[PDB]
């Protein structure tokens, strides 16, 4: 994997109308993967490696958590949101990869963590260090058991 760098000219002509994003590191990123539980998530290790690599190459300092219970996820997401580093970074990233249902994801113990509770950890009241800073979340998890059969193309 390689990440093509932007040009100085692209920066100069776009930074005024964008979130400030120049800190080194650009932010902390957290990649939390659950694979063993809700069948084993084969290929889940490829996703995890790929994102760790991606986010480092994008200039993030990456923290990783693997195979955590719902309660561990909540406690550790809370610890991550409260890190002091957030005051001197310009952005934040959280990727959660697991099984899930609509609005929640599973811990390895088969219990559920609500996504609203996650987003709340990082909001303007609970995480003042990230106020006005862009916060990205990528959630790889089912939102239901319905398989989409697809439709023809008319």
């Amino acid at each position: 994997m390689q990440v093509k760098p932007c040009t100085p000219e692209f920066y100069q002509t776009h930074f005024q109308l964008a979130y400030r994003l120049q800190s080194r590191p650009r932010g902390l990123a957290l990649v939390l993967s659950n694979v063993h539980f809700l069948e084993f998530r084969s290929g889940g290790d490829v996703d995890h490696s790929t994102l760790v690599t991606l986010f480092k190459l994008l200039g993030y300092d990456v923290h990783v958590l693997c195979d955590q219970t719902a309660q561990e996820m909540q406690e550790k997401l809370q610890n991550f949101a409260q890190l002091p580093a957030h005051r001197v970074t310009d952005s934040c990233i959280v990727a959660l990869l697991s099984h899930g249902v609509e609005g929640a994801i599973y811990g390895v113990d088969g219990k559920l963590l609500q996504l609203q509770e996650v987003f709340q950890l990082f909001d303007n009241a609970n995480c003042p260090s990230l106020q006005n800073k862009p916060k990205m979340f990528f959630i790889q998890a089912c939102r239901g058991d319905e398989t989409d059969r697809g439709v023809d193309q008319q």
């Binding site: 040009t7 979130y19 994003l21 790929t50 990205m136 790889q140």
Partner: protein, 98 residues
Amino acid sequence: KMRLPTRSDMICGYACLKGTAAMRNTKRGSWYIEALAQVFSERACDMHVADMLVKVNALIKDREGYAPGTEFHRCKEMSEYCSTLCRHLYLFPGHPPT
């Protein structure tokens, strides 16, 4: 002074839509992370994050399941993103240079 809503400046990418399953390949991994890594590595230099998630939506829409003799053969998925961002989000990778 200016105050803030309780929650703002977030963007959330979802692998699939409300009510539906997200798809994962046993060797290549998840369709959504595979697409996101391709797009970001390649377009972060010149495209904002919300626009890169649109590109990822394009890739996900055209993919289909390969799993003969199961309910997943030729199945589909659609990714989405939700945004409370208030500006362009450009990651400016590798600027300034070393």
